[PDB]
């Protein structure tokens with residue numbers, strides 16, 4: 590049984606699991622290993638002790654989230670959610686963002702990262718499934734929160750999940766970039782705090798684009814596989830982007846995606862914390878590789 594095995598396992602250290610690395614890859618990990626990494630994330634962010642999470646309940650919640658991801662989705666599945674969460678962890682620790690945030694905000698971000706694609710690119714994200722699982726018998730990892738803490742946390746979770754809509758990122762990013770440019774960025778400002786949390790969610794969600802080349806190349810295959818599947822479904826129920834016949838367009842699309850969407854974000858995030866530079870560096874390196882491919886075409 591998955592639950593018995595998970596609950597009984599020793600949770601290795603964050604160092605052993607490499608989850609502090611921006612360059613982290615999940616390719617060689619089993620599902621069990623991704624669950625243990627996830628436990629280590631909650632544990633090393635001081636969320637387990639601080640909020641009186643029962644070990645068995647945390648284990649069951651992780652398994653419930655994992656099993657509620659559809660298996661026939663090539664990219665937006667448990668592994669992407671898990672990677673989003675790992676990137677959050679790395680940003681908080683290696684990126685030194687943890688000291689900028691409260692415990693409830695960290696709790697909410699980690700849960701949102703893990704849960705944000707449950708109701709699965711300008712796709713809409715929903716938090717209904719996330720909440721249902723959190724309220725499920727035996728899965729109530731927030732039961733240890735006071736009423737006031739609980740209300741605060743749910744609000745942040747909802748906003749964080751919604752933030753992963755790229756349409757909302759595009760709508761709100763100009764204000765973020767300008768606050769930064771005009772040296773007006775101030776996390777003590779509740780509006781700006783909320784804005785920053787949304788941008789951090791996007792940064793983590795898009796983080797495959799920053800990985801070492803062999804890793805980005807493979808994730809890009811999954812993304813293309815999902816796009817083409819959706820094209821096929823739209824036919825039975827298609828642009829070039831979602832057309833398996835226009836695959837030689839992928840390098841050029843990836844350069845476009847980096848230039849239009851990703852680069853400014855990791856530039857802005859680096860301005861907020863220099864220790865997040867490796868995300869920016871990785872994204873720059875991947876553009877150069879995709880461009881070289883777009884020209885050999």
Ligand SMILES: CCCOc1ccc(S(=O)(=O)N2CCN(C)CC2)cc1-c1nc(CC)c(Br)c(=O)[nH]1
Pocket residue numbers: 710795797798809810812813816830839842843845846849850
């Ligand atoms: C790899 C297969 C191609 O993948 C893409 C193709 C096109 C675009 S686009 O719509 O931004 N495109 C270029 C910019 N443009 C001006 C509009 C047209 C995005 C991606 C892309 N999305 C994600 C987020 C799911 C990840 Br992750 C990723 O790696 N790739």
